[PDB]
Amino acid sequence: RIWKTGITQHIGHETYIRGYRLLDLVGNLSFAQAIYLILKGELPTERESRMMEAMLVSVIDHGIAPPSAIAARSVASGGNSLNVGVAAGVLAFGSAHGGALEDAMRFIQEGVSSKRSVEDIVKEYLETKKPIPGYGHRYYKDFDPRTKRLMDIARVLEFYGEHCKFAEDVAEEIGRQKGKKLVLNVDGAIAAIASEMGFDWRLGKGFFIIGRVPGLVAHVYEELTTEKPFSKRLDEERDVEYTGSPPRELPQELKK
Amino acid sequence: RIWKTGITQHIGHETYIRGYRLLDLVGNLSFAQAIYLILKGELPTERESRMMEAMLVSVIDHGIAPPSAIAARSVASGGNSLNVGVAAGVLAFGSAHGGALEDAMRFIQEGVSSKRSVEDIVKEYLETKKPIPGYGHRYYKDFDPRTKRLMDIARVLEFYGEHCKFAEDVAEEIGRQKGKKLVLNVDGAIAAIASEMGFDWRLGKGFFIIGRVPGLVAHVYEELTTEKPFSKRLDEERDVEYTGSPPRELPQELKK
Amino acid sequence: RIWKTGITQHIGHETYIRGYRLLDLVGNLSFAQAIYLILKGELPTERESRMMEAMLVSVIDHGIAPPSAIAARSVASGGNSLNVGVAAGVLAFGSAHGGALEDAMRFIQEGVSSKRSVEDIVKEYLETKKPIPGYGHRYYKDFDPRTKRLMDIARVLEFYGEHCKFAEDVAEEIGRQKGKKLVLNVDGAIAAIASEMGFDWRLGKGFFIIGRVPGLVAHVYEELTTEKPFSKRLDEERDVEYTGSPPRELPQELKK
Amino acid sequence: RIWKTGITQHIGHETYIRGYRLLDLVGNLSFAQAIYLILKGELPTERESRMMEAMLVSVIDHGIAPPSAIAARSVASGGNSLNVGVAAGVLAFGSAHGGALEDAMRFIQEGVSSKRSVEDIVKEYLETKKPIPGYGHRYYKDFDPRTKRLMDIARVLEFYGEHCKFAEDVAEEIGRQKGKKLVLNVDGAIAAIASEMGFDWRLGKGFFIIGRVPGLVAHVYEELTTEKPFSKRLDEERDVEYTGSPPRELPQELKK
């Protein structure tokens, strides 16, 4: 059998999620707790449950400006069902729009497991001019308030552990070595928290997708119900710079 | 400005969701409550919050068999990032795999607002041989346990209202008119509950997408981490029936 | 066997397309001729071959302004492989960006097969205020030059037939009944030509997709190789109009 | 202006592709020639034109078995428009289903430009156990007939050059060093030909997408017109192996 899975099975037409009867989860687990279960394979603790609710809310939407929203709404504008627009948004979560969560989780997890000093790890990255994933922001040069909020919650709950500490120690050390502070950004913060929960770095973008899809749904629904179809189109004379060949004739012999 | 929105804005680089500071929502609202807010535009009541958690959990996954899971995992098998596989799954939520939520919400809402008798509404549909959306199941002929669970919760919470009543009254009336019971299925149940919350029928598939994306993430992650790339391919001799032209030669003059 | 097909089969690991050995088609049929074969199931005539080359070239690209190009390039900007950006473009070919080909083919084919007068058909549509598919243009009020080019070729080749005639007769009749000319647009022209070839109206968008994908590839490649990742993002203060709730505080009791 | 392009522009509402009036290309260039133009930026020679027709035909379809066809048809089965199914197919062209064209073009181009001996290049790859892109096949151990057909055409046309020679010299050298022949497969053959044309290796998947989309259209159209919606679903008891947790009860305190 080529179709193998350990996620879900049906016993007597009833759905079981990671071994639990779905009908027993309905009304008893929150959606974030059920998400933790389906992804991890086991029920979350109370502290994990609260952190998962906070991580997912943290990324629920970022407005109309990101390429995901532009893509989702442009596909909707072409005259498509809501699922099709949302899917187009999800496609935009590439290396520059979600991949940093995977990269930062790998860096934080490998950093903690290496048992090498934060000084040595940061020196090695800064020396080879390789970007440290999950650090830096165009505007925030003191701290990323989204990271601070998540870390404050992690500390109040006594969830904050070795991965959170490592991620913050690295920001402080980058500042020390560069003489210029580089913040632990929200991608690095979510990566630290998901790592603290024991999730594989290869699942990093999953948290972002699950959290942001409600925002995409809102954007696509708004485009479909408040805008005329085909309204998302550029005005070539106003919005576009042409950089190509000026007009030219085909060779005469090719004209029929 | 062609890019208009009432969903989110940034004030001093901080994100505001439907007017609320996102950093104040983080740690204070559950993910399902934040979903209600972003979609509806206002905070949910306590009863709405509980029903939204239950609806979303109800659809979190349905195993590897649906075309969404097949598509998501086949795209992942082609050697793609997790977002790309999940998006392919979302594309599969078409008229036969999610559209019934839109249709059932329109039927339930129009049914309630018409103030026509349930007998008359059902007689008109059965007479014109048009399928009644949100009713019937291949296996469940007494009741859909997923609907029963959701409706039991709605009744315990005193959330059950005119839309839930209408949806159940229609199932009973179909049974009365056909002499054969046709259940209110889980699509009809979610449609009734979302209608009870005052959501537009055009948002119906949104609830399904938001709820099921965690399952798609789990399936795509499992395919990427437990299976060899390109393992999702058919065996033509074993799995395929060819119904086309038998082999034939091109005309000789076309062979160079 | 649930996987049935009459398109392609393998005999001794060799691919056969609609019964012809693919290796015999390579070097002997043009790409447009092979497209006709795979879609229709039989080889094209010389006139069909020339018309298919012309239809496909007619739609090869329309610049960066359409929502398909915007979506494709925005997905590429998110940091994605070329296939992922192209696919996002294809998603945008909805009811307002390709669906008119399906609609116009159905209208032209049903119009020709009804044997009702063009006067009566147009009167019935204009009376019920239903848009006639494949007619009208924002700028072209005399003739669509893209339609004229295709129809001139169809006439020179003696391909122009009952479907082409019907489509042009309808434009003339709309003008006669409205006292204002409404052109047969390029969607209607391609629909007429594909109908003249005997293709099903349900394949209409297929011609557009096949023809335009080279343009999408060009756009995505250009975005990936000439622009910095994440460059396709709006500037909220400059490009966006916010129409939602002004900022508001959460209820105090919800703040922890 | 953030939307820059050198591909297409409009002058007086008329489309210009790489500086040529689109209406002059229609009826005068074949579709494969127009594809070459839009991708390369200049008109093809007669030999390039013939090779482009042959490359594109070579990949037009591969039947229902690949994950692209499975994904496209499964999305169509969910009840979606033809563009949506085709797009899902295109998403499946990942690292294991199209990426080898990019890799093989880079290898062939870098191999030719290095001016290092084929012996040295192959020894370095075989020593580090890195797969050589564009070589090997599960069944063909003497030669890939699809490569032979393309190379025979390239030789008859006097198109065969330094890139084609390098690609074939590498297959012969792998055989010499391993004592077991590894064929130049069709991905390597197309990569060699596209490299001979001077295309960038980053465009490799583009040729595959453009060539295969007609096959995807055929598959999606066939699924939509010959199969019942939702027919593409697995039978869990027959097709799936469950490898997860056996059923288990939730903790009693969580049951309300």
Ligand SMILES: CC(C)(COP(=O)(O)OP(=O)(O)OC[C@H]1O[C@@H](n2cnc3c(N)ncnc32)[C@H](O)[C@@H]1OP(=O)(O)O)[C@@H](O)C(=O)NCCC(=O)NCCS
């Ligand atoms: C957001 C971003 C573009 C802003 O960078 P910026 O405006 O150049 O940063 P600053 O002005 O504060 O300057 C920081 C300095 O450290 C460098 N730097 C920036 N981010 C860095 C990082 N994450 N790791 C190491 N060095 C970094 C900059 O080049 C600059 O160097 P300088 O000494 O030559 O001046 C950038 O930091 C970034 O890409 N962050 C995310 C990193 C990431 O996650 N990437 C990998 C996954 S995609």
Ligand SMILES: CC(C)(COP(=O)(O)OP(=O)(O)OC[C@H]1O[C@@H](n2cnc3c(N)ncnc32)[C@H](O)[C@@H]1OP(=O)(O)O)[C@@H](O)C(=O)NCCC(=O)NCCS
């Ligand atoms: C799941 C489904 C395929 C199973 O149908 P089934 O196995 O034929 O149903 P049953 O064997 O219990 O028989 C029910 C009878 O009512 C009909 N019927 C089934 N679902 C019906 C519905 N929702 N409304 C009205 N009539 C329906 C059947 O044709 C059958 O008629 P009969 O008197 O000729 O025997 C079907 O009920 C269905 O499609 N349900 C969803 C409906 C929906 O939401 N569609 C619209 C949005 S896609």
Ligand SMILES: CC(C)(COP(=O)(O)OP(=O)(O)OC[C@H]1O[C@@H](n2cnc3c(N)ncnc32)[C@H](O)[C@@H]1OP(=O)(O)O)[C@@H](O)C(=O)NCCC(=O)NCCS
């Ligand atoms: C491109 C388009 C938006 C431009 O329309 P426009 O600028 O309003 O057209 P005009 O100014 O030339 O006026 C044409 C008149 O006929 C109407 N009209 C426009 N297109 C029409 C059509 N295809 N069929 C019937 N009536 C049409 C207009 O409403 C207007 O009516 P009026 O008597 O009240 O003034 C429009 O014609 C269109 O949508 N064309 C494509 C139609 C199509 O294929 N739709 C169905 C598939 S999506």
Ligand SMILES: CC(C)(COP(=O)(O)OP(=O)(O)OC[C@H]1O[C@@H](n2cnc3c(N)ncnc32)[C@H](O)[C@@H]1OP(=O)(O)O)[C@@H](O)C(=O)NCCC(=O)NCCS
């Ligand atoms: C199709 C494929 C799976 C079949 O491989 P196979 O059945 O193992 O091959 P064979 O049985 O003929 O044996 C060839 C030998 O060379 C190795 N080999 C296979 N393909 C190779 C390649 N392209 N380069 C180098 N070594 C290769 C095999 O491991 C085997 O080694 P052995 O000495 O230990 O027996 C494989 O060759 C392949 O993946 N080809 C495509 C390569 C490619 O393009 N990859 C990079 C982009 S994804």
